[PDB]
Design a protein around this ligand. Structure first.
Ligand SMILES: O[C@@H]1CC[C@H](Nc2ncnc3[nH]ccc23)C1
Length: 167
């Protein structure tokens, strides 16, 4: 039993809700919140900008130190950093950005990072400003993630489309 509430169950291990991931993280305090990161951990907009804003820019400060030490992430890769006031940990995962021409097949690799964590609160990778089809992202999530994932979808209209079209 965990504290996630109001989710629709899609599969044995994947759950979905119309929610603001920032507000969901603030209420649940999950062990892991996933950020829709880029390779530079520049959290300017989309989910990343919203998560970072909710940390009063502490996520960005920590991220800049991480990059200065380690260099950029790989597309499809991840790193674990602090969850600040939102979660114990933040798993920064880099899905491909279609608006940069990145290969969509890397979306499966990106979701594989979730399997290193037993339970996660997450957005749909490569959705929103990353330019992928959220319906495809949900399919890859379901077919790749084996651990327990709670997906927060900000837009009510998209949420309804994802549920109604789910196979
Ligand atoms: O990137 C586009 C634009 C926003 C959508 N993604 C999100 N999904 C869950 N919670 C969120 N809070 C803020 C954004 C957000 C998709």
């Amino acid at each position: 039993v965990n504290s996630f509430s109001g989710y629709l169950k899609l599969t044995d291990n994947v759950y979905i809700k119309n929610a603001d991931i920032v507000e969901e993280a603030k209420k649940v305090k999950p062990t892991v919140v996933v950020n829709a990161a880029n390779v530079y951990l520049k959290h300017g907009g989309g989910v990343a900008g919203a998560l970072n804003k909710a940390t009063n820019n502490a996520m960005q400060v920590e991220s800049d130190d991480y990059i200065a030490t380690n260099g950029p992430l790989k597309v499809g890769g991840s790193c674990v950093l602090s969850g600040h006031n939102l979660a114990k940990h933040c798993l920064h995962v880099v899905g491909p950005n279609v608006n940069k021409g990145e290969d969509i097949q890397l979306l499966k690799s990106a979701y594989e990072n979730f399997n290193q964590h037993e339970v996660l609160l997450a957005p749909l990778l490569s959705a929103g400003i990353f330019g992928a089809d959220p319906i495809h992202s949900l399919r890859v999530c379901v077919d790749t993630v084996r651990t327990n994932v709670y997906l927060a979808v900000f837009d009510k209209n998209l949420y309804d489309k994802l549920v109604s079209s789910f196979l």
